[PDB]
Task: structure prediction
Amino acid sequence: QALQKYSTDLTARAREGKLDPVIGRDNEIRRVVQVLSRRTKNNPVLIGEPGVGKTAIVEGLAQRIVAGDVPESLRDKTIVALDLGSMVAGSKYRGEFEERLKAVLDDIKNSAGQIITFIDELHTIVGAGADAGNMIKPMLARGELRLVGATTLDEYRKHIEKDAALERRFQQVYVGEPSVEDTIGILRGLKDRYEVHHGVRITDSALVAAATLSDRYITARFLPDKAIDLVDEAASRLRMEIDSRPVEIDEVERLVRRLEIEEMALSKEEDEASAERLAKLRSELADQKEKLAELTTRWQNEKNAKEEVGPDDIADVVSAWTGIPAGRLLEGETAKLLRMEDELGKRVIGQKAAVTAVSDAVRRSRAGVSDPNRPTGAFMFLGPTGVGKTELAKALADFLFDDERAMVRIDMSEYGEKHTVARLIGAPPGYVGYEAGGQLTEAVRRRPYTVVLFDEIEKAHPDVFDVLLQVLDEGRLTDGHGRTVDFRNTILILTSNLGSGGSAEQVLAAVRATFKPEFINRLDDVLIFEGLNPEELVRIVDIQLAQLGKRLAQRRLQLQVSLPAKRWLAQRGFDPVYGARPLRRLVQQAIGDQLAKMLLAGQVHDGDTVPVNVSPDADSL
Amino acid sequence: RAREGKLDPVIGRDNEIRRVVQVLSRRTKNNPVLIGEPGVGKTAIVEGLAQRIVAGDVPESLRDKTIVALDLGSMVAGSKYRGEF
Amino acid sequence: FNPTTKTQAALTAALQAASTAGNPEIRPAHLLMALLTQNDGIAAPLLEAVGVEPATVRAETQRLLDRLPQQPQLSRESLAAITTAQQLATELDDEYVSTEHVMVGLATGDSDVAKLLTGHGASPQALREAFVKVRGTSPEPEATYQALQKYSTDLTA
Ligand SMILES: Nc1ncnc2c1ncn2[C@@H]1O[C@H](COP(=O)(O)OP(=O)(O)OP(O)(O)=S)[C@@H](O)[C@H]1O
Ligand SMILES: Nc1ncnc2c1ncn2[C@@H]1O[C@H](COP(=O)(O)OP(=O)(O)OP(O)(O)=S)[C@@H](O)[C@H]1O
Ligand SMILES: Nc1ncnc2c1ncn2[C@@H]1O[C@H](COP(=O)(O)OP(=O)(O)OP(O)(O)=S)[C@@H](O)[C@H]1O
Result:
């Protein structure tokens, strides 16, 4: 009767049908049985990584006993679930806990083996002392109490294997994680338990996707557990959608009910610079109130003539998680991908050969054609200076994230000595900086969709190349802590400045003599950039002037530029040895200097608009 | 406190509260953990969820759920004996 | 009953000084001497809260000890004191007995100590307000009781 106070009844719980169906894993359960039914030392311990199913095996054995598939040596035996936490509850006096545990042990021995104690998280059996969890050591080695335990793989060697007198009384059972084909079956069996809790239906083509998809995207966790979450979340989200309106009709309404209040409390601003902001916000409101009322119409076109989860809700879940977009190109993204070297051309000018290669390994990955285990694209573009090869790697990180500072840049010119490698991989255990991990590593392990940029790579020491050697071609590198980080979704970009003027084989042979063939072989196309012709500078001129104008709008201060000045600046863009950097200095020598002189000398105030005009030699405002 | 009007208004962050709710109402292992750099708003989201529950914008399963803010500091206050914690 | 460590130490000190004294039964004046001369004593500021002089709390109760003919057991007045103390702990729901609880039980249990505290000037309505101005609801030990005044100094003062 002391076993009623400190434990529940697993077999009784399994009798009333309160446990999930256990599928497969025949070998593990048969070994648990043939260990649990020997003369002495008859107590197994399941062992293995967290999530692969180790309480599932004990619950399967309990259901199996209740049914009657077990041998004669185990027919009609009850399994009790010991609870070490509720025993040390009130034991402040000097012997009460030992008294409790002794009563429990005596009561277990008082039966004739009709009880199988099952301790979960048994690594907690070492403490309870303050000579505790130690009075069990005699009864263990004789086979009185049949113990079924299950702890993860690495708290075993941390709490138990430290005590080789106690770990002798345990027989280990290793529980390896299943494969995709087996996880599919486990899900096929468990589906009808979620189909009830959520009032929905789940499609087998979705049960296959929730297991194939969650095997190449979520690598930090193990099997089935990392494949049941997708199904459960998809169902819960679908039920939410069923009750209320669908998504993308809810957020459009939530933000509209906010822009209203914004413009309402903004229109009462007795101000003049705030009138250009109100007249700009008042347009996005009418633009949103357009597609909102279009969605409410397109929803009735379907509601007059999305009721079970498919292989699409799963992808949407594994995309909201982990940030990686793996969807189906829902007709809004494809129209944007189709004109990409057109949205990149607003920031980079020329280099058509290189824009149509960076942009070419994004489509052939969003359409599901690239190798699923290798980086999305790994190519190095190199050429003369000031040509636009560090700008392209920023016009690209802005097309995908809408923020130029959401990417990972490391300036490879500080890696002059080989010992500077530990800066991006961590320091081995037992050294100064170890509870910090790597620096490149920990940056990608948190958001595995960024675009890495190794700037000025040939200035480094030829060992960091050999570190990168396996990043390309496999997308993996492990830090000090032993955590493997995957790169199979990033875009690897390496700039350079080799050759410096050689036509095509003074540079192609200067790359070959600075890098090794095993490093050139992992790369995709080696893009060559080209100098700037006189025509393709008259356009960078416009870009620069637009930039400066946008920078000036902090004072509502514009400026008018005449075509003579616009083609004077571009003709004073000179020296096809320095690219397009001199022009940014010419602009500030000509316009910016005298504008700033006039600006703090009175005689120019906000709201004005200054026209530039080419004096016979210089520019006059 | 959300009923008594003592929490600041919470603006924006719709995707996050949506995901928090849908994780908070699934069958097993429903424990959302807001993670991210310090300052970007992680208590503000929970306060927004509380005000949203008081208002009524939540799905059916989360009607009248009475969020509770635990405290493990005042729980280990005086427990020098063997089982007091 | 439900003891805290200070009442346990007071009972142990009174029992050691009683077994040294050689008595058939331990008087309440042993416990009173143990509590007024206790380290970190919360009885002398308790009587400071009700305006009682401390120059008589070691003389007029000392005369209740050196008139007895020098293992004792607890007097029935002391058991009634602990009984009314445990009863008086049920309103403020403090889970353990305290030194002020021992004091109010001794003031209600034996009328001999109540006679002395009434002759020095103290009412049970006033000494029930003696602690609330020095306390400020209770665990087992005593690390409350104006914690700002014992773990800080005043820069403005
Ligand atoms: N063979 C299986 N058949 C059916 N469901 C399974 C099977 N293996 C695991 N599961 C389910 O997958 C999840 C695994 O959870 P558990 O196995 O209880 O956790 P665990 O494997 O013990 O990991 P730890 O060490 O306890 S944290 C549960 O939802 C189980 O119901
Ligand atoms: N084709 C181009 N289109 C637009 N801006 C360009 C172009 N080429 C250079 N620029 C400008 O030049 C600056 C950036 O030049 P970068 O390409 O970053 O220099 P680089 O190509 O990395 O050469 P090095 O070897 O790194 S100095 C920015 O101010 C750009 O506006
Ligand atoms: N979306 C938001 N709406 C309204 N106020 C916000 C929002 N996000 C942040 N704030 C305010 O900005 C501050 C952010 O503080 P918190 O988000 O509570 O701190 P935190 O983000 O939790 O970081 P830590 O780790 O808790 S110190 C508070 O003053 C919030 O009131």
User: Anything to note?
Assistant: The CA atoms of residues 58 and 148 of chain A lie 8 Å apart. Chain A is about 40% helix and 10% strand. The two ends of chain A are 99 Å apart (CA to CA).
